[PDB]
Amino acid sequence: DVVKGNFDISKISGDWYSILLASDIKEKIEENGSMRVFVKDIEVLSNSSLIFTMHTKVNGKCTKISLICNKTEKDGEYDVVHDGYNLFRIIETAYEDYIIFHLNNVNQEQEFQLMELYGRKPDVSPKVKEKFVRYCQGMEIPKENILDLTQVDRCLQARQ
Numbered sequence: 001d002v003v004k005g006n007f008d009i010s011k012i013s014g015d016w017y018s019i020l021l022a023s024d025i026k027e028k029i030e031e032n033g034s035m036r037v038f039v040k041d042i043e044v045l046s047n048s049s050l051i052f053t054m055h056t057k058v059n060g061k062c063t064k065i066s067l068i069c070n071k072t073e074k075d076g077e078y079d080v081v082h083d084g085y086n087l088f089r090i091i092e093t094a095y096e097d098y099i100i101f102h103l104n105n106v107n108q109e110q111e112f113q114l115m116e117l118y119g120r121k122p123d124v125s126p127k128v129k130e131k132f133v134r135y136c137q138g139m140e141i142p143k144e145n146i147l148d149l150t151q152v153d154r155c156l157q158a159r160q
């Protein structure tokens with residue numbers, strides 16, 4: 001049930017797992033990188049904001065953070081503060097299976113894009129992962145810059 005636009009936001013509510021991570025700056029998503037953050041859940045805060053809870057590593061320990069995301073003037077776009085100012089939007093989702101997010105980090109050193117694949121479960125179809133890899137390459141993210149997190153510690157032991 002792939003939705004490609006006009007997403008119902010309340011249907012992306014609830015728990016998510018981070019599965020694949022991609023960026024045109026690999027350091028951002030590798031171990032210790034500012035964007036190596038594992039989603040826990042998404043909830044509707046208001047008619048125009050979301051709240052994400054996510055895990056980061058702090059001195060080796062999985063640590064929960066909360067992020068407030070607001071609709072911008074552009075349709076489908078949200079902003080969020082983390083390692084600077086970010087703009088993100090949904091690329092596509094099957095609400096009960098997976099969601100793909102695109103993010104832009106707007107900083108003065110070098111702007112970069114992030115691509116994220118979440119699943120309702122700690123894994124999804126190889127069909128879904130293939131769809132994501134294709135999007136990444138269409139966005140000129142090299143395959144070396146796509147990381148599979150199902151192999152690594154994604155704080156699953158700490159989600160509570």
Ligand SMILES: CC(C)[C@H]1CC[C@H](C)CC1=O
Nearest residue numbers: 037080082088101103116
């Ligand atoms: C801070 C990062 C990791 C979060 C913010 C919200 C996005 C939908 C997913 C994402 O890139």
